[PDB]
Structures are given as structure tokens and as C-alpha cells.
Amino acid sequence: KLKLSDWFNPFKRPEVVTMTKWKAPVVWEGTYNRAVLDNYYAKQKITVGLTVFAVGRYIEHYLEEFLTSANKHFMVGHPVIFYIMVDDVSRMPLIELGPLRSFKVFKIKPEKRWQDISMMRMKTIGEHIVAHIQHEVDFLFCMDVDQVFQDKFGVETLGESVAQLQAWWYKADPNDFTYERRKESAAYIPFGEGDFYYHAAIFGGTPTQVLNITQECFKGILKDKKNDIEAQWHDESHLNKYFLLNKPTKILSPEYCWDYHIGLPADIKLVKMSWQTKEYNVVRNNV
Numbered sequence: 001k002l003k004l005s006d007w008f009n010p011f012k013r014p015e016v017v018t019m020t021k022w023k024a025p026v027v028w029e030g031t032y033n034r035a036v037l038d039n040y041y042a043k044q045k046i047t048v049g050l051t052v053f054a055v056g057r058y059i060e061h062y063l064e065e066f067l068t069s070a071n072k073h074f075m076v077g078h079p080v081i082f083y084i085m086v087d088d089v090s091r092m093p094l095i096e097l098g099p100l101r102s103f104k105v106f107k108i109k110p111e112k113r114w115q116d117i118s119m120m121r122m123k124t125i126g127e128h129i130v131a132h133i134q135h136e137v138d139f140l141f142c143m144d145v146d147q148v149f150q151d152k153f154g155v156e157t158l159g160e161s162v163a164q165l166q167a168w169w170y171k172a173d174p175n176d177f178t179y180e181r182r183k184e185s186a187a188y189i190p191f192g193e194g195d196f197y198y199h200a201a202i203f204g205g206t207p208t209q210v211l212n213i214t215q216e217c218f219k220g221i222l223k224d225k226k227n228d229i230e231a232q233w234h235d236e237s238h239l240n241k242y243f244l245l246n247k248p249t250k251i252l253s254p255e256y257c258w259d260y261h262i263g264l265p266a267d268i269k270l271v272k273m274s275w276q277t278k279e280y281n282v283v284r285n286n287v
């Protein structure tokens with residue numbers, strides 16, 4: 001029965017949004033007491049999971065760097081299981097893992113369109129939750145592979161449902177967010193609505209919550225298909241609709257998923273994860 005103020009002090013970061021109107025914390029560098037949390041979670045003997053997909057040349061371009069950096073920086077001090085989904089196991093980089101890390105690899109079907117590779121993750125993650133992850137971990141993160149951990153990404157990020165503020169939009173007004181705006185899409189969010197723009201590169205929660213996130217997003221994806229529409233930002237559009245309806249119980253600041261193309265402004269104090277430069281001419285095979 002951890003209490004928010006046990007570990008979270010919004011006053012340490014007075015110039016950024018630290019609490020939502022539904023009283024979920026927005027976790028910024030300086031606001032969290034990791035020691036308090038490491039002790040608490042170690043006493044419950046938690047395990048944390050991490051899913052990552054790499055299909056096609058995303059394997060060679062990003063998977064090693066992702067996993068090497070995750071080994072070093074993700075939930076250090078707690079058992080972690082990396083679940084790696086690839087279309088060709090023969091190209092899996094098999095790095096050395098450190099204390100309290102282990103992994104397993106699964107072969108998946110490569111979808112033809114990169115858009116569908118990205119969106120089908122929703123289906124696949126749920127399948128894996130039901131079959132095994134629910135029995136293996138207390139919390140799970142689902143992440144894009146095209147990014148690199150830069151510093152500690154620890155238990156301060158854990159919660160029932162966890163969303164990532166997207167780096168380019170965190171100070172914007174909702175009517176500037178790139179939600180899907182066509183009412184024919186299941187991902188539709190009208191003008192005048194919206195809390196934040198969440199990044200689909202990182203989301204998480206307990207296995208139960210992540211099952212519901214992924215299942216509801218995939219239902220939307222499938223519905224759109226039947227209506228011959230494809231959301232503007234694919235699974236991210238659906239994820240944003242989900243989290244509008246089912247508010248996240250924790251949000252991570254853009255420090256947890258930063259685009260250095262923006263530079264490094266005052267609000268980004270310690271970067272925990274950075275985007276890789278895009279290489280679509282090589283890693284994608286369709287428009």
C-alpha cells in the first residue's frame with residue numbers, strides 16, 4: 001500500500017505538469033524517490049517484463065543497441081525478462097546479459113506492410129500475455145526497438161497503466177495534437193477533447209491492464225480495416241483514443257523518450273531514453 005507522496009514530490013519540478021486532473025503523476029527527473037521504491041518493490045520480489053519487436057532490417061539496425069542499453073539501464077536491481085519478437089531468429093544478436101536479466105525469443109510472421117508490422121504488435125502482445133507473460137511478471141513495458149536507453153529507467157515508472165508523453169507535443173494544446181480526426185475511424189478524437197498526446201513507442205502496466213490496452217487497440221485496428229480506413233498514426237492513434245477513454249494511472253515525462261533532434265531544452269533534465277535517427281529508406285520496404 002505504497003502512497004503517492006511516499007515517493008513522488010511534484011514541487012521538485014514546479015515549472016512542468018506533474019499532476020493530471022485525474023490525479024495521476026507525471027514523472028519528471030527530480031520528482032521521484034527511487035530508493036524508497038527499490039526497497040518497496042524488492043520486498044515484494046517483483047519481476048518486470050519488456051517486449052520488443054524487430055522485423056526486417058530493424059533487427060540489424062536497432063535490436064542489439066536496444067537490448068545492450070536495456071540490459072544496462074532498465075529496472076536495475078530487479079529481475080527483468082526481455083521478450084524479443086523477430087521474423088528471423090537466425091539474425092538475433094545474442095548479447096551478454098547482466099545480473100537479474102534473462103530473455104527469450106519468438107519467431108513471428110512478418111506482415112507485408114510496415115504499417116501492419118507496427119499495428120499487429122497489439123495482437124501479438126496480448127497473445128503472449130495470455131499464454132505466459134501474465135504468469136511471469138508483475139509489470140510489463142512494450143517498446144519500440146528504434147530507440148536507446150541512456151540512463152536509469154527504473155521502478156519509478158511502474159504502475160497499473162503507464163503512458164509516455166510524446167516529445168514534440170508535451171507543451172502543446174490538444175487541438176494541435178495529431179490525433180486521428182476522421183470520425184469514420186475507431187481512433188477518432190474530436191477537436192475539443194484530449195488530455196495529452198501519448199507516444200506509442202513506450203507503454204506499460206500490469207499484464208492485466210496491458211492486455212486490455214492491446215486488445216482494445218487491436219479491436220480498433222480491425223474495425224478500421226472493415227471500414228476501409230487506416231488511422232493517420234496507426235497504432236499510436238488507437239493508443240491515444242484508448243488512453244482518452246481509460247486514463248493512465250501514471251505518465252512518463254518526455255525525459256523518458258526524448259528526441260535529440262529537438263535539442264535539449266531546460267525542461268529535459270536527464271534523458272533516460274532517446275530516439276534513433278529514422279532510416280526508413282533502408283528499414284521499410286513500402287510507402
Ligand SMILES: O=c1ccn([C@@H]2O[C@H](COP(=O)(O)OP(=O)(O)O)[C@@H](O)[C@H]2O)c(=O)[nH]1
Pocket residue numbers: 052053054055056058114115117118143144145146201278283284
Ligand atoms: O518494418 C517494421 C516496422 C515496424 N517495426 C517495429 O514497430 C515499431 C514501430 O515502428 P517505427 O519505430 O518504425 O515507427 P516510428 O517510431 O518511426 O513512427 C518499430 O520500432 C519496431 O519495433 C519493425 O520491427 N519492422
Ligand SMILES: [Mn+2]
Pocket residue numbers: 144145146201
Ligand atoms: Mn519508433
